Amino acid sequence: MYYGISQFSEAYNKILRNSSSHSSCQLVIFVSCLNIDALCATKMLSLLFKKQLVQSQIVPIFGYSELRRHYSQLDDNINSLLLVGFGGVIDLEAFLEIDPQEYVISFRRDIYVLDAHRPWNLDNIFGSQIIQCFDDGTVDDTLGEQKEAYYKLLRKQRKKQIHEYEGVLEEYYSQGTTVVNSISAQIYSLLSAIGETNLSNLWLNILGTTSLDIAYAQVYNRLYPLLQDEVKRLVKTPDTLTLNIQPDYYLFLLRHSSLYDSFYYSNYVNAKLSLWNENGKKRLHKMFARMGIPLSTAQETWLYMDHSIKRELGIIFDKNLDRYGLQDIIRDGFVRTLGYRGSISASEFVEALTALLEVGNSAQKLTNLRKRWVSNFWLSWDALDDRKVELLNRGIQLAQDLQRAIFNTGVAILEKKLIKHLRIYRLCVLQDGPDLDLYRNPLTLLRLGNWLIECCAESEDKQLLPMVLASIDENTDTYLVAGLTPRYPRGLDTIHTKKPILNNFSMAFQQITAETDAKVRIDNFESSIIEIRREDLSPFLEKLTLSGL
Amino acid sequence: DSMLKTKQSYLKLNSVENSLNGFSHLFSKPLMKRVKKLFKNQQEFILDPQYEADYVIPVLPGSHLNVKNPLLELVKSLCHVMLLSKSTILEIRTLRKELLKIFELREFAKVA
């Protein structure tokens, strides 16, 4: 590894020695837009560097084209560059035509790349001094064999060594993309080693770690005990700040919507009870009748809902939910209280943040959409501070609206049975419908796909197949296609969790694009999301069917 | 040839005219199979680089239509030629709908 966890401080010190100036901006940060973990890490770094009065600039980017253009725009005065949330999986020198001898003098510049994706570029590690990253504890142990081959490959019977090195390189490659650690977790480890931890840093770390609960529950379970221990280590006067470990549930905005709406829109309960048809609603009313909560009472706001049943909710759940297999909904979460404003939870906060990212406020309109996404990112960043709550209530209401729209589309998809089951992977295309203009956002599409994946996984089928989802935007006449990995049921043991399911969709897409002249545009930071033409989709799909996955 | 054959057969027998009513029945099935095969081959060989020469849409003076799929215009012209019968309209419309069902299009779409 280049920078081990223990060496972080040293690198940090170098930054000061290269950036502490009186009237010169010598540090520029590029962040992975449309990502909560990147936003949390950027906020923590911004507070850190505001503490020591180090001048800096924050610049969000969306695609690799923007990255290259902005790197070209930069001047030699900028000694230090940060690249947080991306850049691990590719070699930047080839992308950025970086001449080491142009930047030798050594260390003319410094580029600190900080990314989470476990498979990445090995040459970026073992080849270049100029590019440097923070390892999470992967190169030291996992990559012990590949480095020998790379070092050796950097008399007539010696071709066996070359063949073995090529085979080792191929074996290391051809691996699907995954995430195994958190940028916010790494930054908080650095802060703990330095000695600047406080409640704001802990809150941002909690947000960053809980933003992965949807997709990387294994990583979340690995990281939870450290957060628990650290929060243990660290009269209701109007200035108290309380961070407590209170029981919580896999429910959608439980403390801001009615309990009925929470049970109705919770994805896990939807999957477990088939709420898209009438039998699900009948079983939900059975649930409520057997628990004993009146329907008109349970359809009231959580603030005005009855105090006695608010107190007895835990016992009611513990005694009622065993029969119907929902006993996995109970978990332990973090609750934040500051003043007389009320109480909030990490799950609700991240849902509000995601919704505010989604909704806020040919090539020309694509640029306009990307600019609007950048503006939404800035608005979500501004909403972080505790001095603004009209920028969080709006996010909560937008989250409710977006979940309603997603549910309305998903029930229609399920009833029309548009999910076509092929021999290898399932396919679904949204040709027509209402409110299709919302799904131009990749995160909205991923939310819809996550709900569909949960619904499909909570079934009696014994086939684990990837799902391909596509949409339409009539103004551009293009299909936005996203590849999705299968997921195990949340109520499963760790024995059958040897490795997370890998994503080969990016590899398949890049291979097909490199062998055929399709009019695609692969520029998103997420390598499994591409834009394809309506006329070109079908042959492309056929190729994907006939190619080795 | 089919039209000439059916007119000769009618004359042999003796706004509607029976000289031509019943001529599309002779070639419907081979046409359907040929169109299926052509669609499959176009789907398979449209994205290949070396086969892109034969799918190039020619340009001529006075042309104004920009369009993508050649087989669609082939079948559109083939059906429009038949539609000039003015006496077997329903049969031609049925055959046109059947041909369009091979594509994922509808009877009264603007693209058709």
Does B69 contact A at CB distance below 8 Å?
A: yes
- Cβ-based neighbours of A409, under 8 Å, separated by 6 or more: A430, A433, A435, A448
CA distance A411 to A434: 13
**Nearest CA to CA, how far is A424 from chain B (Å)?**
19
CA distances from A168 to A88, A138, A146 (A): 20, 18, 7
Is residue A85 a contact partner of residue A545, using CB atoms and an 8 Å limit?
Answer: no
CA distance A455 to A410: 10
- For A455, what's the count of Cα atoms within 13 Å in the CB-facing half-sphere? 24
CA distances from A398 to A253, A403, A436, A444 (A): 12, 8, 17, 12
Tokens of A40: 């949390």
Q: Do A536 and B43 touch (CB under 8 A)?
A: no
Is residue B3 a contact partner of residue B24, using CB atoms and an 8 Å limit?
Answer: no
Q: Do B43 and A542 touch (CB under 8 A)?
A: yes
**Nearest CA to CA, how far is B28 from chain A (Å)?**
27
Is residue A216 a contact partner of residue A179, using CB atoms and an 8 Å limit?
Answer: yes
Does B109 contact A at CB distance below 8 Å?
A: no
Provide the H-helix boundaries in A341-470: 346-358, 363-382, 390-416, 442-457
Resolution (A): 3.9
Please name every residue paired with A331 in a beta bridge, in sequence order, or none if there are none.
A248
Tally Cβ neighbours within 10 Å of residue A252. Answer: 23
Provide the H-helix boundaries in A28-81: 36-51, 64-73
CA distances from A401 to A305, A394, A397 (A): 22, 11, 6
Does B61 contact A at CB distance below 8 Å?
A: no
CA-nearest residue of chain A to B48? Answer: A516
* Encoded amino acid at A211, one letter: S
Contact list in B for residue A539 (CB cut-off 8 A) is: 43-44, 46-47
Candidates B42, B43, B47: best to mutate against A (most CBs of A within 10 A) is B47
Tokens of A532: 């394809």
First to last CA, chain B: 27
- For A70, what's the count of Cα atoms within 13 Å in the CB-facing half-sphere? 18
DSSP state, B48?
-
- Cβ-based neighbours of A135, under 8 Å, separated by 6 or more: A1, A2, A3, A4, A5
Contact list in B for residue A535 (CB cut-off 8 A) is: 68-69
Which residues does a chain break follow in chain B (C to N more than 2.5 Å)?
14
Residues of A at the B interface (Cβ-Cβ below 8 Å)?
516-518, 535-536, 538-540, 542-543
Contact list in B for residue A536 (CB cut-off 8 A) is: 47
Pairing of strands A57-61, A27-32: parallel
Does B71 contact A at CB distance below 8 Å?
A: no
Nearest-5° Cα angle at A250, A247 to A251: 100
Tokens of A52: 């020591």
What letters, b where the CB count within 10 A reaches 16 and e where it falls short, cover A374-383?
A: bebbebbbeb
Contact list in A for residue B69 (CB cut-off 8 A) is: 535
CA distances from A92 to A64, A172, B46 (A): 11, 19, 35
CA distances from A439 to A211, A212, A413, A435, A455 (A): 21, 21, 14, 8, 19
Tally Cβ neighbours within 10 Å of residue A23. Answer: 5
CA distances from A246 to A249, A308, A334, A336, A349 (A): 10, 18, 6, 10, 15
Tally Cβ neighbours within 10 Å of residue A162. Answer: 12
Contact list in A for residue B43 (CB cut-off 8 A) is: 538-539, 542
Among the listed residues A25, A10, A38, A52, the one whose alpha carbon sits nearest the alpha carbon of residue A381 = A38
Provide the H-helix boundaries in A74-122: 92-96
> Which of B44, B48, B68 is opposite residue A535, by nearest beta carbon?
B68
Q: Do A518 and B47 touch (CB under 8 A)?
A: yes
Provide the H-helix boundaries in A462-516: 505-515
Q: Do B69 and A535 touch (CB under 8 A)?
A: yes
CA distance B109 to B89: 18
The per-residue DSSP string of B52-108 comes to TTTTPPP--TT-------HHHHHHHHHHHHHHTTSSSHHHHHHHHHHHHHHTT--TT
- Phi and psi, residue A427, nearest 5°: -135, 140
Among the listed residues A409, A423, A416, A421, the one whose alpha carbon sits nearest the alpha carbon of residue A451 = A409
CA distance A312 to A238: 28
DSSP state, A390?
H
Does B47 contact A at CB distance below 8 Å?
A: yes
* CA dihedral (A484, A488, A494, A497) positive or negative: negative
CA distance A156 to A153: 17
> Which of B43, B47, B68 is opposite residue A516, by nearest beta carbon?
B47
Does B85 contact A at CB distance below 8 Å?
A: no
Contact list in A for residue B68 (CB cut-off 8 A) is: 535
* CA dihedral (B48, B54, B59, B63) positive or negative: negative
- Cβ-based neighbours of A217, under 8 Å, separated by 6 or more: A490
**Nearest CA to CA, how far is A518 from chain B (Å)?**
7
Q: How far is CA B57 from the centre of its chain?
A: 18
**Nearest CA to CA, how far is B48 from chain A (Å)?**
6
The dihedral formed by the CA atoms of A110, A114, A118 and A119, expressed in degrees to the nearest 10: -30
* Encoded amino acid at A539, one letter: P
Please name every residue paired with A531 in a beta bridge, in sequence order, or none if there are none.
A480, A521
Is residue B16 a contact partner of residue B87, using CB atoms and an 8 Å limit?
Answer: yes
Tokens of A264: 């109705």
Q: Tell me which H or E stretch contains A228.
A: helix A217-233
What letters, b where the CB count within 10 A reaches 16 and e where it falls short, cover A447-479?
A: bbbbbbbbbbebeeeeeeebbbbbbbbeebebb
Is residue A466 a contact partner of residue A177, using CB atoms and an 8 Å limit?
Answer: no
- For A518, what's the count of Cα atoms within 13 Å in the CB-facing half-sphere? 28
DSSP helix/strand/coil, A465: coil
First to last CA, chain A: 31
DSSP helix/strand/coil, A266: coil
Tokens of A540: 């492309």
Give the position of tokens 């449309």: A34
- Cβ-based neighbours of B107, under 8 Å, separated by 6 or more: B96, B97, B100
| Greatest CA separation for chain A | 86
CA distance A456 to A453: 5
- Phi and psi, residue A393, nearest 5°: -60, -40
CA distance A65 to A61: 9
Q: Do B47 and A538 touch (CB under 8 A)?
A: no
Among the listed residues A267, A274, A236, the one whose alpha carbon sits nearest the alpha carbon of residue A251 = A267
Give the position of tokens 């029969």: A323
Tokens of A342: 């009320």
